[PDB]
């Protein structure tokens, strides 16, 4: 029994709208990807399937590239890894770009003929390409891949015979770039990327009515606010820690459009975001580029090296409420956590609590998780009174964003009751 529908929008291709009244936290759609892969960063640190930060990863006997959590995970992924395994062995040790490997996976999937439940609303051939509205460096970037693609797929693909006809590579990639989704783990860390054709119908907003969470590679679409019938459905395409400017910039450079959202048009919260001295945070912003490099690759130690310096450096001057300051804290935290310096972790993250409340308005999965992490630490620290507070708060947020359908709730409840037992 369905709850939404496809339609041609005002001026922007297609889109998605409701067909019933929808309350907060309602589960609207649910999909496995059509194709997905572990992104370069997390490669060789999470499983090419369940996508989970783990112990002892056995690597495909054949290619010796793909890594797997269990013997079952390996077996399950095999339908996909089947063909690529070959090429990955030839690339060794040169490893192909995510978007390339991803495409390989979509090629093969369209070459079995499975009525993929991810395409139930919009096929792959229906996806926007923006061919006519692309720049030149962009177009020249695309021809790049096609070349790198064909060298990579030498082993399995010799010519357009083995491709589904009415199918252009150059075109395909265009679809990829603006139709891809960043997959995150429980701790809202980016671990892989995939295409979710039915979900791609959702359009952008900087203050949207819908969220997406990932239970491993499995995607959940939920409502976040009360929605009246016939209303267009939107998610945010971006991180919420950006300025009206930054947002516009990427959207042009990646999706090829100018934003409509109220917020974009009236520089919403932009003052607060940049509150402070430009000269300080102009340097801070720069350092972060090299820092986040060492985050996607899980270099932790090295990130903390850089982080701790800057927070102690501009401790006298720059407030927590500034985004760049905050971003550092956020990192400083995720560092200490993966290092074990939990006392330190807490001391930091606890300071991100207030800014987050402000920047992540309503019910946002990121805020929830953050709160959870912070409460979880307090619980570890034995600050049960303050812990119970956040855990509850976090629950109250996540009961909307995740639902009983996401396994992380099961884990959060258990934390609540454990905290309970220490208040006995």
Interface residues toward ligand SAH, by CB under 6 A:
12-15, 128, 130, 178, 200-201, 203-204, 255-257, 260
Please name which of 351, 335, 361, 423 lies closest in space to residue 387, comparing C-alpha atoms: 423
The piece of 67-75, 164-172, 297-305, 344-352 that touches Zn ion (CB under 5 A) is 67-75
Question: Does residue 62 touch Zn ion according to CB under 5 A?
Answer: yes
Residue 50 is assigned to a ligand binding site: yes
The piece of 69-77, 92-100, 345-353, 403-411 that touches Zn ion (CB under 5 A) is 69-77
Question: Which of the listed partners (ligand SAH, Zn ion, none) does 84 bind, with a CB threshold of 5 to 8 Å by partner kind?
Answer: none
Cβ(11)–Cβ(218) below 8 Å: no
Cis peptide before 318 (omega within 30 of 0): no
- Give min distance, CB of 113 to ligand SAH, in A: 23
Q: Alpha-carbon distance 232 to 282, whole Å?
A: 38
Residue 170 is assigned to a ligand binding site: no
Output 110 or 201, the one with its CB closest to ligand SAH.
201
Compute φ and ψ for 301, nearest 5 degrees: -30, -50
Residue 12 is assigned to a ligand binding site: yes
Binding test (CB under 5 A) with Zn ion, winner from 50, 134, 146, 274? 50
Q: Alpha-carbon distance 380 to 377, whole Å?
A: 5
Question: Does residue 85 touch Zn ion according to CB under 5 A?
Answer: yes
Contacts of 281 by beta carbon, 8 Å cutoff, 6+ apart: 274, 318, 322, 324, 325
Question: Which of the listed partners (ligand SAH, Zn ion, none) does 264 bind, with a CB threshold of 5 to 8 Å by partner kind?
Answer: Zn ion
- Give min distance, CB of 194 to ligand SAH, in A: 15
Please name which of 172, 210, 218, 170 lies closest in space to residue 194, comparing C-alpha atoms: 218
Q: What is the DSSP string of 96-158?
A: --HHHHHHHHHHHHTTTT---GGGSSS-STTS---GGG--HHHHHHHHHHHHHHHHHTTTT-S
Judged by DSSP in three states, 194 sits in: strand
Output 8 or 271, the one with its CB closest to ligand SAH.
8
Burial of 317 (0-12, 13-18, 19+ CB in 10 A): exposed
Residue 81 is assigned to a ligand binding site: yes
Contacts of 308 by beta carbon, 8 Å cutoff, 6+ apart: 332
Q: Alpha-carbon distance 389 to 353, whole Å?
A: 12
Please name which of 330, 288, 308, 380 lies closest in space to residue 187, comparing C-alpha atoms: 330
Output 67 or 175, the one with its CB closest to ligand SAH.
175
Output 184 or 291, the one with its CB closest to Zn ion.
184
- Give min distance, CB of 202 to Zn ion, in A: 15
Question: Which of the listed partners (ligand SAH, Zn ion, none) does 184 bind, with a CB threshold of 5 to 8 Å by partner kind?
Answer: none
Residue 204 is assigned to a ligand binding site: yes
Q: Which residues are annotated as a binding site?
A: 12-14, 47, 50, 60, 63, 69, 73, 81, 85, 122, 130, 179, 203-204, 237, 257
| Residues near Zn ion, by CB under 5 A | 47, 49-50, 60, 62-63, 66, 69, 73, 85, 206, 259, 261, 264
Residues in the annotated binding site for Zn(2+): 47, 50, 60, 63, 69, 73, 81, 85
Q: Residues marked as binding for S-adenosyl-L-methionine?
A: 12-14, 122, 130, 179, 203-204, 237, 257
């Amino acid at each position: 029994p369905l709850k939404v529908e496809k339609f041609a929008t005002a001026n922007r291709g297609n889109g998605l709208r409701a067909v019933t009244p929808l309350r907060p936290g309602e589960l609207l759609f649910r999909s496995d990807p059509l194709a997905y892969t572990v992104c370069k960063g997390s490669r060789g640190v999470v499983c090419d399937r369940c996508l989970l930060g783990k112990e002892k990863l056995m690597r495909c006997s054949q290619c010796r590239v793909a890594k797997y959590c269990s013997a079952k995970c390996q077996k399950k992924a095999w339908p996909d890894h089947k063909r690529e395994c070959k090429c990955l062995k030839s690339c060794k040790p040169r490893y192909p770009p995510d978007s390339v490997r991803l495409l390989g996976r979509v090629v093969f999937k369209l070459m079995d003929g499975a009525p993929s439940e991810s395409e139930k609303l919009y096929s792959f051939y229906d996806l926007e390409s923006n061919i006519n509205k692309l720049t030149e460096d962009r177009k020249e970037g695309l021809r790049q891949l096609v070349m790198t693609f064909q060298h990579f797929m030498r082993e399995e693909i010799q010519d357009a015979s083995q491709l589904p006809p009415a199918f252009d590579l150059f075109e395909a990639f265009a679809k990829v770039i603006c139709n891809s989704f960043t997959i995150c783990n429980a701790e809202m860390q980016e671990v892989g990327v995939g295409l979710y054709p039915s979900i791609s119908l959702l359009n952008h907003s900087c203050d949207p009515n819908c969220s997406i969470v990932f239970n491993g590679p499995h995607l959940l679409l939920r409502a976040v606010r009360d929605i009246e019938v016939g209303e267009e459905l939107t998610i945010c395409y971006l991180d919420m820690l950006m300025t009206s400017e930054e947002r516009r910039k990427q959207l042009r450079d990646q999706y090829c459009f100018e934003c409509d959202c109220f917020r974009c048009q009236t520089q919403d919260k932009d003052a607060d975001m940049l509150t402070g001295d430009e000269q300080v945070w102009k340097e801070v912003q720069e350092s972060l580029k090299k820092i986040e490099e060492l985050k996607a690759h899980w270099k932790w130690e090295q990130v903390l090296a850089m982080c701790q310096a800057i927070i102690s450096s501009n401790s006298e001057r720059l407030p927590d409420i500034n985004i760049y300051q905050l971003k550092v804290l956020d990192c400083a935290m995720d560092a200490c956590i993966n290092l074990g310096l939990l006392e330190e972790a807490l001391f930091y993250g606890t300071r991100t609590m207030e800014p987050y409340r402000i920047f992540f308005p309503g019910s946002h999965p990121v805020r929830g998780v953050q709160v959870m992490k912070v409460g979880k630490l307090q619980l570890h620290q034995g600050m049960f009174p303050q812990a119970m507070k956040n855990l509850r708060l976090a629950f109250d947020i996540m009961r909307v964003t995740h639902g009983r359908e996401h396994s992380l709730i099961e884990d959060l409840i258990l934390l609540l009751e454990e905290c309970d037992a220490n208040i006995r």
